[PDB]
Design a protein around this ligand. Structure first.
Ligand SMILES: *[B]([O])([O])[C]([C][C]([C])[C])[N]C(=O)C1=[C]N([C][C][N]C(=O)C2=C(O[C])C(O[C])=C(O[C])[C]=[C]2)N=N1
Ligand SMILES: *[B]([O])([O])[C]([C][C]([C])[C])[N]C(=O)C1=[C]N([C][C][N]C(=O)C2=C(O[C])C(O[C])=C(O[C])[C]=[C]2)N=N1
Ligand SMILES: *[B]([O])([O])[C]([C][C]([C])[C])[N]C(=O)C1=[C]N([C][C][N]C(=O)C2=C(O[C])C(O[C])=C(O[C])[C]=[C]2)N=N1
Ligand code: NA
Ligand code: NA
Ligand code: NA
Ligand code: NA
Ligand code: NA
Ligand code: NA
Lengths: 199, 197, 214, 218, 203, 204, 213, 196, 199
């Protein structure tokens, strides 16, 4: 697995790979790892699929009702805390990392990590097995004040670089761009991945 | 380590237990009694881990006595045996499993004499003869040799003698003296303890 | 927490004239991996007290959440009674011990700086509920590196000023950056005085690698 | 054990404490951990006390053999190579952590040598259970080309930080300055820490059953 | 530890050593390994000290509570049974406890070996602890049912003394009681090494 | 533990122009004591004795194998061995078994046959020497022996004062150890004479 | 794996005189081969006529002292009087045994005054077995001090020595010299020596220095 | 499991071994002999693991016999015992360690009677009396009680009786019969087997 | 540890970090990991220090005598095989990776990996603990036909990016540039490391 969220002026870009591994076997080569929690809040799924989905379902259920009780869309800080508290409470039992991101009327585009029940807002974050191989690239290639297109390029480049090196990551790149205007879903295929040195 | 034996007859049941209460390497008691009176016509002989035997046996004893007081008649050897089996089977997959091996010898007025066998797993088996302990590995083949269904009680004691004498000759543990009892129409009967030089 | 994920390394601490100062680098290490290089491991508890934490960051963030709420709950009443530095240290000893004694410890080692009623408080607490006071403190690997240097100066001069204490702490974090593999050269200093709790950062130490030409 | 080393302008200084611990009990209060190798080569002993003892003994003999044959004062690179290749063959089971210091033809030299057979050439180093305290003192206040007076003071301060800070370490600071013109072995250079006693039993208080007296007569 | 007890013509002797031992180190030279429940009831101790002390003090509580309820002193059978039930409820928990309950009641002189497993044996003679075996040797060899009071004391005193000689984890002082129809009497708190030196000098 | 299987206790001590050496007399196997006159101190010359605690088979083996080498030395050299030389011979002997060692912790005590100045030392199982100007201990009651020795020892003690010090140090230490005691033996090594005594110790 | 205990060390000691009771300790707190602190004395005041020494794992020491402090009040609230020294020692057994299956790793020595006025020491193991003593050592240097206390206070292995009782002058000097000897040979004993002296007049505390290495 | 005992006198050495050759739970032989004649005035009594006892004992026996043939005189009990110790000590840290417990009883013309003791570790100890096996835990305290250095041989057999009778009373293993032999000036002497 | 060798027209650039770790402790913060085997052949040391030095000593000894026996400088293929065969023979026992590189009159500048007794010539290679974090960067940033200066920049950037992320890597960057003209040694200090995103 490789996941990645990126923050900008009035929105977030959010990307994953599509490989569900079972050791050396690929169980599913076309799995969307960007699950919606609310209308303008997603989470990038990583680690155990059974654990990651169950938290996303429970967070979605909790955030649906929480949204209706306030008569407003939930905050991304609220959705990040809902995922945090579940991940923290059952940290021994669960083996998944749900990176949460979206948009608010209040604080705008924002990205949160919830690695083992912690909470931290970052300008970008990366997770899963393939994130190991691209810490150098994301440090090198990230600069602040990127557009939607510059972020989508950067998220594709990083996840493609990881997919090349990580065995557990592979397939297609699924992309989500969240703004005030809405949610732009997009699927960069394995055919049209950005080529680099691969020898 | 301990040793039990039962020999069913036509109208009776002979039984016998050893009298060593062992501890580590020491023979703490030479006169210990391993038979428990359930009813007037029933004995439960019990062997196993140190505290488990008496606690289990006595729990059964008192419930058999409770059945007598409640209803004005005692349990049959069949009823008593399946009751013993039901308790040991329920404890098996629980916090407190009793590691006990036992014989239930008895006499019913309708059904006649009965010797039952039970391991710590709580498998109940009616038998013409049986034995528990490491001594059973030596003595069971002697019972196969000389037992017949029509064996007289005076002969059955002389058969018992050959089993108990084989333990003195071949079994590495001491076991110098043995309790001996018969059950029939007229209830439980004590007999002379088979001691040796 | 049986197995911690994102650990923070050493938290330093030392008393000075009319105050206490603590220091802790801003790194969350995922084993060897320097994952989170900009996270605050120091916490403002109240006006009188501050708290730095080694070990697992999620357990520290839980303690930050619980303490923060306790201080909120106290400040609602507004009855001229506050948790002293010693009182928070006493509570936190009982918290870690209770969790230790349920075999579900909060995987942290913490330093509690504070100033109240004229007196300076510096207090250690670990995951097992081992607690004490001392003129200086250094958790984790800083116990073996940094605590020697603090006791060296405090033997020669027991009572330091703020600038003596600050320039000492800057000298300690330089040694930790060199010798601790799990440290980083982003850190925060947090002082407490009559004025209250200041948290200055991010800072860096000026390094020297001239010994590489020998 | 806290042992340490330091390169200065005219030479090298080697430091060591005097405590020898058996588990968590102090066996020896006063022992020399700075061992002779050559006239201007000495070595600090840490880790397994027997392995530190016998390797330094063995290499000293090898350097005496090597110096007698060559007719030359031995090189500090040679002791490091001999130690390494001894220690590497035994795969760390000979558990001798050693700081090797000296002067030769090519100047003052300091080498850290670990029991698996790895080595490091350095200007300052520390080893043993209180290495971190001593190494923290060196990092704080070391500069290139120290004076003879400043190096002694720094190296005493390093070994002292271990003596107080580390439970394994204790007692006095032994030291050894190795200038160009020979080596000054400053044993008991410092003493960080300073009773009534007197339990005079009367002769006859101890009860006796057997007595035999064997006279010797020279 | 080494405890012993035997019945004879003039009631029941009960003798114990006094050594406590955390590993090879001697925790304490003189520990009292007999509990005095009432004037007509004693309890020897061996194994884990805290288990022995707690559970036999809890026996004593219940024996004292039996006296107040029923208006009569508890039997030796009932007291021995009640302790074995406490041990039965804590079976498999790693309790180590090797008592003998000595007393006098309406039934006569009584002696019961009670154990951590739930074991509960009525008998004339018993011995417990690490020195168990060495005590039996001396005790059995010089035993008669028809000993005098002084000859009974000589047997119990010697048996603990020769056990402490061989067993590393037994030593200190012999603490010998004597049970009668009119309650127990403490015979002696004699030092073991002085007795072993005395028997050496007799040859 | 391995050393505590047979147990034992050995001690040596310094005075003015004299040295003392002493040890318990228990040979046992775990709980069971076997005999009460087992030799743990062995002569290596007139004014030089070696004491050996720990595993009894290796106590005897190291004593015998050291005597083998000693007698070869004395014949070859044409003299009595110096005390510092015997330490190194033991150190060599034990370190020869570095990765398969004799489970014994020797304690040497003697006077130098030229000058008659006191010498003491002890070694660990792998033969690391430790010379002291005060005392040395080895056994299952090392902790107990240290605490007595540290408090009771004084410098420059006469032969009668040394005996009382070392005896009370042994007796009280072995009386707080289950696997040491059953008598004590003490050798007072002087220039003119060797004064061996056995104490009225506890036999439990 | 997670280990809930750790050895912090330190030594404790108590002596019972005819009219007094000493209870003393070192002030070193350790972990591994580092010193946590040099001012962590193991003596804790309970009542005017009773003091307790506690050594071993320090997390349990802090808790167990706080339990005893809490229970003292609960008794005084119920019974309208302070607990006697013997009643504290009996209560401590039940608290230590209540954690039989997850021990308080704390070597306890209570010392103070019984109801008859005299000295009374009670020594313990971690799970709550206890007895009254004249003297007892505990903690890290238990093995070092105890046989010297057996010798000098018990008069063991000595003849032609009159068995005179301990003066408070003599006992205080003995406690200084034994803790000096422990500090030399024990790594976990050092820094300073707290000595609490319990007489009918009250408690008073001295602080002699020890080896700081 | 097996059991040995020796009682040294002023001018003799009494010894005795059990006669059970056990296997699993069965007493294969009631008449087994555990004593091995080293010399005319020496017995080696040997107990332990099944094959180890006889192989070790016989290796020593033949080398003691080889010493007789080579030199025209037998080994002393001291010499024989230290020889037994030297072999067992060298095997201890090797591929083939013999787990054997043994007594070497003998009589020298100069030095008089001698009983030696040895565990599988090869610690040699001269003793006035000793015993091996779990039976030694019961019987050693009986020897402490009634032994004196000046004990007569006819009394020493009555002392032996009390040890062997204690095994029948208290020891859980059978051990019905025992071999018995005395060594003195006139060599080895068989005695009546103490049956029950 | 982080090591890196790079190949170009008429030479090789070769770089390491300087941290010798012992768990969380830094034993030596200024260790040169670029050891000479011959006058124009180096190896980049990695893994176990004791193992890595012993192979370098034995390879140096073997290649010294081999060079004198031919009356020529040894080939880099020869030095790569000398390191390969030692690493392969004692692969169970040793726990080190010696990347070998240099210059020849025959085949010029060349870089070889010897990971667990294998042999492979690459245009660039990376090794040690910190190499994990920079596989994305080196794939992204490498292009063929670089100058000496472009290679020295690329080797510094990659090793600095790794030193930021890897705890076991740190200190200074040691650099070696091997050509026909000679060996250019250079030490980029911790003061003057190239800055990237580090938050
Ligand atoms: B991704 O994290 O790889 C992905 C993300 C989900 C949201 C779809 N998760 C999975 O593909 C995944 C794998 N598994 C269970 C099977 N796991 C393993 O076999 C496994 C493996 O093998 C790949 C390894 O590596 C060798 C380890 O070692 C850490 C552990 C488990 N469920 N979902
Ligand atoms: B007595 O049983 O010795 C005595 C009787 C009391 C009433 C005071 N009990 C104790 O001294 C005692 C011992 N312990 C716990 C310590 N146990 C051990 O040290 C230990 C030992 O050594 C005796 C051994 O033997 C080698 C083993 O191995 C089986 C295990 C533990 N608490 N109270
Ligand atoms: B570099 O590879 O880090 C460097 C390169 C040399 C040429 C200088 N080598 C070292 O720093 C180094 C480390 N060590 C021995 C210490 N071993 C380990 O750190 C280690 C550990 O421990 C954390 C672990 O797990 C605990 C593993 O995994 C099994 C491997 C190594 N010697 N030289
Ligand atoms: Na892939
Ligand atoms: Na003793
Ligand atoms: Na004893
Ligand atoms: Na100390
Ligand atoms: Na120290
Ligand atoms: Na780094």
């Amino acid at each position: 697995t490789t996941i990645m969220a990126v923050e900008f002026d009035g929105g977030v870009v959010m990307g994953s790979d599509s490989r569900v591994s079972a050791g050396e076997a690929v169980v599913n080569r076309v799995f969307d790892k960007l699950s919606p929690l609310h209308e303008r809040i997603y989470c990038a799924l990583s680690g155990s699929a059974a654990d990651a989905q169950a938290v996303a379902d429970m967070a979605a259920y909790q955030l649906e009702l929480h949204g209706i009780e306030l008569e407003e869309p939930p905050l991304v800080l609220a959705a990040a805390n809902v995922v945090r508290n579940i991940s923290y409470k059952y940290r021994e039992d669960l083996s998944a990392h749900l990176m949460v991101a979206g948009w608010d009327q209040r604080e705008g585009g924002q990205v949160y990590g919830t690695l083992g029940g912690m909470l931290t807002r970052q300008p970008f974050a990366i997770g899963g097995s393939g994130s190991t191989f691209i810490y150098g690239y994301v440090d090198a290639a990230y600069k602040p004040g990127m557009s939607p297109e510059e972020c989508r390029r950067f998220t594709t480049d990083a996840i493609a670089l990881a997919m090349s090196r990580d065995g557990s990551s592979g397939g297609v790149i699924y992309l989500v761009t969240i703004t005030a205007a809405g949610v732009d879903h997009r699927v960069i295929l394995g055919n049209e991945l950005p080529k680099f040195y691969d020898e | 380590m301990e040793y039990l034996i039962g020999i069913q007859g036509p109208d009776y049941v002979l039984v016998a237990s050893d009298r060593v209460a062992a501890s580590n390497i020491v023979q703490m008691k030479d006169d210990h009694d391993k038979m428990f009176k359930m009813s007037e016509k029933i004995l439960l002989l019990c062997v196993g881990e140190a505290g488990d035997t008496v606690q289990f046996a006595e729990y059964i004893q008192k419930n058999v006595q409770l059945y007598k007081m409640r209803n004005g008649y005692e349990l049959s050897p069949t009823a008593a045996a399946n009751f013993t089996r039901r308790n040991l089977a329920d404890c098996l997959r629980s916090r407190t499993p009793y590691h006990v091996n036992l014989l239930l010898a008895g006499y019913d007025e309708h059904e006649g004499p009965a010797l039952y066998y039970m391991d710590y797993l709580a498998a109940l088996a009616k038998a013409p003869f049986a034995a528990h302990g490491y001594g059973a590995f030596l003595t069971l083949s002697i019972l196969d040799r000389y037992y017949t269904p029509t064996i007289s009680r005076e002969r059955a004691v002389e058969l018992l003698r050959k089993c108990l004498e084989e333990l003195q000759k071949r079994f590495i543990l001491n076991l110098p003296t043995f309790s001996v009892r018969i059950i029939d129409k007229n209830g439980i009967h004590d007999l002379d303890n088979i001691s040796f030089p | 927490t049986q197995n911690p994920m994102v650990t923070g390394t050493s938290v330093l601490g030392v008393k000075f004239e009319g105050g206490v100062v603590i220091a802790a680098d801003m790194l969350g290490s995922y084993g060897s991996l320097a994952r989170f290089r900009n996270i605050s491991r120091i916490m403002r508890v109240n006006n009188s007290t501050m708290l730095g934490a080694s070990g697992d960051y999620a357990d520290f963030q839980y303690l930050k959440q619980v303490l923060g709420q306790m201080v909120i709950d106290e400040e609602l009443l507004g009855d001229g009674h506050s948790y002293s530095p010693r009182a928070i240290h006493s509570w936190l000893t009982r918290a870690m011990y209770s969790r230790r004694s349920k075999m579900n410890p909060l995987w942290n080692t913490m330093v509690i700086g504070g100033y109240a009623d004229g007196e300076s408080f510096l207090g250690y607490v670990d995951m097992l509920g081992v607690a004490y006071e001392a003129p200086s403190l250094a958790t984790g690997y800083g116990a073996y590196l940094a605590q020697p240097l603090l006791r060296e100066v405090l033997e020669k001069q027991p009572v330091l000023s703020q600038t003596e204490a600050r320039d000492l702490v800057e000298r300690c974090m330089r040694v930790l950056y060199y010798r601790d593999a799990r440290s980083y050269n982003r850190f925060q200093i947090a002082t407490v005085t009559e004025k209250g709790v200041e948290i200055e950062g991010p800072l860096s130490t000026e390094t020297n690698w001239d010994i590489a030409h020998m | 054990t806290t042992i340490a080393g330091l390169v200065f302008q005219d030479g090298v200084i080697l430091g060591a404490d005097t405590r020898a611990t058996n588990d968590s009990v102090v066996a020896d209060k006063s022992c020399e951990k700075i061992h002779f190798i050559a006239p201007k080569i000495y070595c600090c002993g840490a880790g397994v006390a027997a392995d530190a003892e016998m390797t330094t003994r063995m290499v000293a003999s090898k350097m005496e053999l090597h110096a007698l044959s060559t007719g030359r004062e031995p090189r500090v690179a040679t002791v490091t190579r001999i130690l390494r290749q001894t220690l590497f063959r035994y795969q760390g089971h000979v558990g001798a952590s050693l700081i090797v210091g000296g002067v030769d033809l090519t100047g003052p030299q300091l080498y850290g040598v670990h029991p698996h057979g790895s080595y490091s050439r350095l200007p300052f180093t520390a080893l043993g259970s209180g290495q971190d305290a001593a190494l923290a003192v060196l990092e704080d206040r070391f500069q290139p080309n120290m004076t003879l007076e400043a190096a002694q003071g720094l190296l005493v301060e390093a070994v002292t930080a271990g003596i107080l800070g580390d439970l394994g370490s204790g007692g006095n600071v032994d030291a050894c300055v190795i200038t160009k013109t020979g080596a000054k072995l400053l044993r008991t250079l410092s003493s960080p820490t300073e009773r009534s006693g007197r339990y005079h039993f009367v002769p006859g208080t101890t009860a006796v059953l057997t007595q035999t007296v064997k006279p010797l007569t020279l | 530890t080494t405890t012993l007890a035997f019945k004879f013509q003039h009631g029941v002797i009960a003798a114990v050593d006094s050594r406590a031992s955390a590993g090879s180190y001697i925790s304490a030279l003189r520990v009292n390994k007999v509990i005095e429940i009432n004037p007509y009831l004693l309890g020897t101790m061996s194994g884990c000290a805290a288990d022995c002390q707690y559970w036999e003090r809890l026996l004593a509580k219940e024996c004292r509570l039996y006296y107040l309820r029923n208006g009569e002193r508890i039997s030796v059978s009932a007291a021995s049974k009640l302790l074995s039930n406490m041990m039965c409820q804590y079976r498999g928990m790693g309790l180590s406890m090797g008592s003998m309950i000595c007393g006098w009641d309406k039934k006569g002189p009584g002696l019961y070996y009670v154990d951590e497993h739930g074991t509960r044996l009525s008998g004339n003679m018993f011995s417990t602890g690490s020195g168990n075996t060495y005590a039996y040797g001396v005790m059995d060899s010089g035993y008669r049912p028809n000993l005098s009071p002084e000859e009974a004391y000589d047997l119990g005193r010697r048996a603990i003394a020769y056990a402490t000689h061989r067993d590393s984890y037994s030593g200190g002082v012999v603490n010998m009681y004597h049970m009668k129809e009119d309650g127990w009497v403490k015979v002696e708190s004699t030092d073991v090494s002085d007795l072993l030196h005395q028997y050496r000098e007799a040859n | 533990s391995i050393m505590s299987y047979n147990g034992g206790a050995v001690m040596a001590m310094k005075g003015k122009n004299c040295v003392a050496i002493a040890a318990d007399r228990r040979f046992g196997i775990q709980a069971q004591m076997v005999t009460t006159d087992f030799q743990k101190i062995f002569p290596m010359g007139d004014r030089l004795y070696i004491g050996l605690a720990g595993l009894a088979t290796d106590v005897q083996t190291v004593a015998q194998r050291l005597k083998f080498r000693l007698n070869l030395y004395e014949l070859k050299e044409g003299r009595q061995i110096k005390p510092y030389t015997l330490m190194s011979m033991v150190a060599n002997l034990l370190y020869e078994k570095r990765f398969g060692p004799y489970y014994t912790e020797p304690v040497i005590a003697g006077l130098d046959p030229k000058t008659f100045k006191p010498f003491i030392c002890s070694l660990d199982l792998i033969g690391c020497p430790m010379v002291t100007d005060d005392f040395v201990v080895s056994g299952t009651c090392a902790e107990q022996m240290y605490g007595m020795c540290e408090s009771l020892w004084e410098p420059n003690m006469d032969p009668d004062h040394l005996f009382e010090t070392i005896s009370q140090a042994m007796l009280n230490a072995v009386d707080r150890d289950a696997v040491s005691g059953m008598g004590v033996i003490v050798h007072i090594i002087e220039k003119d004479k060797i004064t061996t005594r056995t104490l009225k110790a506890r036999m439990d | 794996r997670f280990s809930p205990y750790v050895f912090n060390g330190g030594t404790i000691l108590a002596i019972a005189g005819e009219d007094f009771a000493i209870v003393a300790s070192d002030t070193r707190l350790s972990e591994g081969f580092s010193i946590h602190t040099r001012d962590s004395p193991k003596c804790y005041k309970l009542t005017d006529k009773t003091v307790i020494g506690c050594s071993g794992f320090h997390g349990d020491c802090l808790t167990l002292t706080k339990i005893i402090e809490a229970r003292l009040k609960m008794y005084k609230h119920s019974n309208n009087k302070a607990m006697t020294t013997g009643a504290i020692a009996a209560m401590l057994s039940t608290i230590l045994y209540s954690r039989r299956f997850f021990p308080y790793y704390v070597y306890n020595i209570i010392g103070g005054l019984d109801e008859e006025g005299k000295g009374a020491v009670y020594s313990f193991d971690p799970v709550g077995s206890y007895q009254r003593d004249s003297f007892k050592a505990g903690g890290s240097a238990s093995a070092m001090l105890q046989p010297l206390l057996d010798n000098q206070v018990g008069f063991k292995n000595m003849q032609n020595v009159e068995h005179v009782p301990l003066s408070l002058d003599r006992a205080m000097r003995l406690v200084k010299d034994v803790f000096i000897s422990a500090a030399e040979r024990d790594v976990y004993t050092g820094d300073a020596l707290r000595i609490c002296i319990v007489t009918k007049e009250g408690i008073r505390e001295e602080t002699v220095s020890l080896r700081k290495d």
